Symmetry: D2
Subunit: 236 residues, 4 copies
């Protein structure tokens, strides 16, 4: 177990895939995890249950990370239960791949609001809530697409490129008060194209999850404004 001065963590879009592993990983290292879900209570509750059965601390929380007012409410709820919030992971993300010539503005906004605006709101709240205690760490989960572009993903790459850039700006603003901001850019993660990956396999959600954890942990305390690639050598 990595070392955490903080006690709890909010993970957006934590119901499944990468968000679910981040919750597992961080729970296994002694943090109380808050598992944000948007729609399905049963999946999120089953995850919470699974973690409790292993002796870890976990809770579920319903909101839409793209909604300003839902995100503010959800933080107020956490501060009320736990006394504060030390850690945050902006993971909420959707895709809507189309060739640009076919893509409508609505398709572009849809991904921008759900991926970038959501991270802006989360990061803003983190700064509000973590400044009081002069301690925090935030990780934005982004993608290789945000660094290198992709055919059919003008909107995804825009939202991830934006997230990466934005996170650095936050890093500047949280720095004096020891609130760190960093990004992670997964490559191809399980859940053909393996040939272009030097490690010659897909990454697990776990491998991403453990890099997020490092960046939240005290081990990375002189690290802020960095992007950590977790892509098997696909992009260097």
């Amino acid at each position: 177990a990595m070392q955490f001065t903080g006690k709890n963590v909010l993970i957006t879009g934590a119901s499944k895939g990468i968000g679910a592993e981040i919750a597992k990983t961080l729970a296994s290292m002694g943090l109380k995890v808050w598992i944000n879900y948007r729609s399905n209570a049963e999946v999120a509750d089953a995850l919470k249950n699974e973690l409790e059965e292993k002796g870890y601390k976990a809770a579920v929380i319903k909101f839409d990370a793209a909604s300003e007012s839902d995100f503010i409410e959800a933080i107020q709820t956490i501060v009320q239960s736990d006394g504060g919030l030390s850690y945050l992971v902006n993971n909420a993300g959707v895709v809507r791949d189309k060739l640009a010539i076919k893509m409508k503005t609505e398709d572009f906004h849809h991904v921008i609001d759900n991926n970038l605006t959501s991270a802006f709101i989360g990061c803003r709240e983190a700064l509000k809530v973590m400044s009081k205690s002069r301690f925090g760490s935030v990780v934005n989960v982004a993608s290789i697409i945000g660094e290198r572009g992709n055919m059919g993903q003008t909107n995804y790459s825009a939202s991830k490129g934006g997230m990466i850039a934005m996170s650095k700006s936050f890093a500047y603003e949280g720095a004096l008060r020891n609130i760190r901001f960093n990004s992670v850019t997964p490559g191809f993660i399980e859940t053909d194209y393996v040939k272009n990956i030097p490690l010659n396999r897909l990454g697990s959600a776990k491998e991403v999850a453990e890099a997020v954890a490092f960046l939240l942990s005290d081990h990375s305390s002189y690290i802020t404004g960095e992007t950590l690639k977790v892509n098997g050598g696909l992009y260097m």
Copy 2:
């Protein structure tokens, strides 16, 4: 510089950097289309200035953030000129504030005006330049700047994705990232850049001289980054 193409649309071309891009490109033989959003007088004075020097220039009102306006404007150009070879996404605003003071509206305002606008422009470029299997497109960039850095980081990333999508049809996409441009201690060249210095880098990236260059970001900042 050499241009296979014949004309260019520049968004936010009334003044500052956009205006210099128009001058520069007009003096190198391209017919420039000068998009303005609000002030007709400044745009028409620019058009006039360029005409009086024997260059070819036109003016066009539309809001680059508006999908339907951008599509109409291109239709207008295609109708006058037969097509469009070059495009410069320059439309851009700032609204600096510390993130804790910043409202969602402040964030969207910059996103829609800077990033969404470049998306639309790029999309239309692709539609209109594919037919003729030729084009070049330049996306111009612009503590307290979470919204600006988001929109510009996004633009840079998005442009690369466009570069992928235009590549087979020889439609290049590239970015320029100006530093402090005239409207110093941390700038190695120890001076502000002129709008002209930005404008000539745009021109290179549109010119045939940069024909093996796509998906790139060109910094024009005096060594500041």
Copy 3:
């Protein structure tokens, strides 16, 4: 304690500063540390002793990392004592800042040989020795006014490490880099975190990149500079 599938680690220039902390940190997480020194046996022995007195596993080993033949001999020695080598840290490094117009070729080579060539040799040997067992991780510890030679050697190291990452990838030998900033107030003013880093903070990022935790990470550079770049 972070998770290590591997058992031992060689650290070049481990006598003092950052190299010494990498040794302490990794020793405390259960790895047998090999403490390379070039000249002073006493300081290196005192470190080894300190770590053994705490119940950790540690050894010292004399060689010049810039020397091809010395480095090969030393690895042979390790393989022979421990059965193999799972981890390596190229930390051997010098500076010789001067303005380029005053800098001689000898000044440039001096830094290149001691920083870049040394890392090449270490990385090459890592690949030879780790390929048999299809497991390993390697960390290279890496512009500016007055530092044409340093930036050259560090830019090179960073680029070279990626090439290594390609070559070790099929055999699950990962290569990564770390780029410390100012490590222990007018220097501090340009650092967003507004303080110097400790050797520990660098040492723990190295450890992560060696640990199983970073197993899908290769060819990456990890900045440990407090937001300075």
Copy 4:
């Protein structure tokens, strides 16, 4: 393109990319100095070709890896032309090997020929251009230097080093308006398994690289220093 400066030295200018840089720059009115190491005939044939078209050109023998040879050669140019406004460090060799097969001598061979050579050139450019408070210098590197490569631990090292080093030079020349920049070519026509990963779906010409070098030297890029310009057809973004 517009050049305030009047002449240019290009290292390894006999052939390939270096030759095209010379042709390009000659056709835009610069007096070009064509460095060669070994073969006089090829360099002379290039000079001849350019003179027959009414351009200004000279040949100059030296090894860019040798400090003393490079100093002499600049002294020669200053003596003929009054100064030197532009420089292109292009001298470069390859010696690909898998690292486990590579000897230290193989590593140095590329470092000395590619990186040390650029360091010397850049150093001299600074000495010779400072007096007149004007200059531009381009280090021709490679995509390999940005992304690394299987079998090119020594090439990448030397190009990664170049790109980093050039920025340091940019800092040191900035007050005196001496700009330093790099170019990183991708796969350039070498005399369809390479081509499939290139979005533009073709190899670049030596010309397309040559014209990017020219831009970076030209007055058109006067607010650009410490930058790396990729000329790789989208292969790396």
